[PDB]
Amino acid sequence: ARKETYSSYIYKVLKQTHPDTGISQKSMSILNSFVNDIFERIATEASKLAAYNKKSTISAREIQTAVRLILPGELAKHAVSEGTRAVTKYS
Amino acid sequence: KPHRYKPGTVALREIRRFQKSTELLIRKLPFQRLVREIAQDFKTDLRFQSSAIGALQESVEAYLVSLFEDTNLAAIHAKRVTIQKKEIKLARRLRGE
Amino acid sequence: RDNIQGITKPAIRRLARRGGVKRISGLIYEEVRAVLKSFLESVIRDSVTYTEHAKRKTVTSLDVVYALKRQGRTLYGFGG
Amino acid sequence: SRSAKAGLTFPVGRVHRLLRRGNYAQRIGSGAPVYLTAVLEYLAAEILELAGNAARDNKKTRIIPRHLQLAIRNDDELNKLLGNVTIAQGGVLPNIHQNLL
DNA sequence: TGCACAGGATGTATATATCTGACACGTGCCTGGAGACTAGGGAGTAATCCCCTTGGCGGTTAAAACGCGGGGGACAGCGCGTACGTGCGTTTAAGCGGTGCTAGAGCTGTCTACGACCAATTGAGCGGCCTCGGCACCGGGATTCTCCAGGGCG
DNA sequence: CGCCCTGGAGAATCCCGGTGCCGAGGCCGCTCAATTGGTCGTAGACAGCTCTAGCACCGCTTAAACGCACGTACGCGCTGTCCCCCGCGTTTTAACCGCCAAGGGGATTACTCCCTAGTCTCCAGGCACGTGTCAGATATATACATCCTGTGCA
């Protein structure tokens, strides 16, 4: 059987930050649970926010305002900054 | 002359010893027979995996430690060193339970 | 028969040491035991609910984690 | 993949298909998965650097759950973000009351 | 006779070959990446109307604000004793190494109910309205309910 | 000489009419998504088969639990102190209306294009998995290295 995880990506970002210190398997599972939880957080908040506007479409606007309202001003500020930078650079 | 510590000295070094240890403070068999005992009157003839027991015991220990911290602060609000039965009810009901 | 007594008094004393408690009274060991007796029911009940809904005779880790998910505790680690 | 041209790490296709099969809405935009991968990569990078320095303090080249526990608890935004999260094998903080001294 | 010595008979850290565990590298089948068609859902505009303001005089009322007495309740001081803190020896039982099983967990074809998708009717449910009987507020009067002064009692 | 118990007094409350007031519901006009049927293709339950960790168990091997004995010190009860906020009367302001009438911009409703992505399709490649290899921890030769013993001596 097969399964999906963030392992390789967490290791690559680890090499992008501190390419020395390693990560234990259990801590990697904790990070997998964290990202998997925040995914349902932002996704569900985007679903309810999309339901409040009487719209069937979820765009980057819903993710931007949702991330703003569900996160502290620092994390929402930098998250919206780098997020809009990556999206505007992508399109 | 025997060597004896004054009352209250061993409590501090016990706090230092246990606060540095991440091990579980409850034995496996009593918690096993306890969980099975609670599961007897719910659904008869069940099975418990080798896992998920350390999750119940882990959440019970980690939650009960925080309950002992909040209850400890409740005992400090009364200006004493002793935890009392009313402190557990105060710090319990005041958490929304 | 009476497995709730399986928790020893020195165990409750050690759990009090984890919480920073110095001196402990007598009834603490009974009260903490009762609170545990209620907690294990409040969890294990939902754990049996999900297991009965999943058509299984064995309780897994996803059942416990998903059982603590709806209560807001969100237990990480095993069965994430 | 479109993650390299946009300067990302996590795949955009897995998040886009996951949002499609996640039963969220009828229509899904093309910028939403890129935005979500950007936010998730930022938060993951924050946890990785904070837990990394937390591992640097104890002079260990591997990350134990205690390093991540202290890394999340010592930060105000992370403690306020998740206050109900229980970390396994993370222990507690060395909090000692002053009146007991 | 009392004594120093030359060598065996045991230890002991020291150095060498050996046993798990985890990082590191080389694959190929279910994933993603991307190209084209449809189209209805999103961006944009034209009235609109509708309750929401603009600015400030006065007169008067009900609510906010201040001021003092002191009464009782928060609060410091201090003695008591029994209730846990601390220290021993003695026991029951979990940890752990190892074992024989199985019965339930777990991945895969069939088809078949059976629910997703789409015209036609309508009637039950929603906008509009206009009343009166229940509701809002207060007098009348009885009833209880607390506050204060002897005095019979210490 | 000063305190429980009783009696007088006062006022706060309860409850029962008594009449003006307004929105709950009824009634109507209306009108639109539910209902009924047909089509269609599709995932879920039924086996099917398999395979693998949980189950029940047995026996060393320590190691926390426990019983108790002492003890000392803080929780607790009691007492004196004093000061701070409640109860009440007097001062001071917030808000309503009267005058004396006008507009104003922002969500709403309706209309109107237009283009981003669902859907279908095929091509490719990448990370979960198997294997190579060193790091660390392990167990054992070993060259001396410290008592013990013949053992010969002055």
Q: Domains of chain D: which residue ranges?
A: 1-101
Beta carbons of B22 and D67 less than 8 angstroms apart: no
Going by beta carbons, is chain A in contact with chain C, meaning 3 or more pairs sit under 8 Å apart?
Answer: yes
Token pair, residue C25, equals 């009274």
Query: With an 8 Å Cβ cutoff, is B9 touching chain D?
Result: no
Q: Domains of chain B: which residue ranges?
A: 1-97
- Separation between Cα atoms, residue A9 and residue D41, nearest integer Å: 9
Token pair, residue D32, equals 């939403």
Determine, for residues C51 and B46 on separate chains, whether the beta-carbon distance falls below 8 Å: yes
Where residue C64 falls (left for φ over 0; alpha for ψ -120 to 50; beta otherwise) is alpha
How far is CA C22 from each of CA B13, B84, C19, D92, D97, rounded to the nearest angstrom? 11, 12, 9, 17, 11
Fold observed for domain B1-97: Histone, subunit A (1.10.20)
Q: Domains of chain C: which residue ranges?
A: 1-80
Tell me if residue B84 falls in helix, strand or coil.
coil
B25 touches strand E (CB under 7 A): no
Provide the CA A72 distance to its chain's centre, in angstroms.
14
Query: With an 8 Å Cβ cutoff, is D94 touching chain C?
Result: no
Across all strands, nucleotide nearest C25 (CA–C1'): E84
Provide the CA B86 distance to its chain's centre, in angstroms.
17
CB contact residues (below 8 A), chain A span 13-32, against chain C: 26, 29-30, 32
Token pair, residue C41, equals 């029911």
Reported resolution in A? 3.6
Where is chain C discontinuous (C–N over 2.5 Å), named by the preceding residue? none
Superfamily for the D1-101 domain? Histone, subunit A (1.10.20.10)
- Separation between Cα atoms, residue B89 and residue B41, nearest integer Å: 28
Q: D86: which DSSP letter?
A: B
Q: CA B73, B60, D83, A18 torsion: positive or negative?
A: positive
Beta strands D62-63 and A22-23, pairing class:
parallel
Token pair, residue D94, equals 């060395």
Length of chain D, in residues: 101
Instruction: Give D37's strand partners.
Output: none
D62 touches strand E (CB under 7 A): yes
**Method used to solve the structure:** cryo-EM
Token pair, residue D9, equals 């790490």
Domain C1-80 of CATH type 1.10.20.10 = yes
Closest CA relative to residue C67, chosen from D66, A31, B55: B55
- The H-or-E segment that residue A10 falls in is helix A7-17
Q: What is the CATH number of the domain that holds A53?
A: 1.10.20.10
Going by beta carbons, is chain A in contact with chain B, meaning 3 or more pairs sit under 8 Å apart?
Answer: no
- Separation between Cα atoms, residue C46 and residue C43, nearest integer Å: 6
Across all strands, nucleotide nearest B3 (CA–C1'): E87
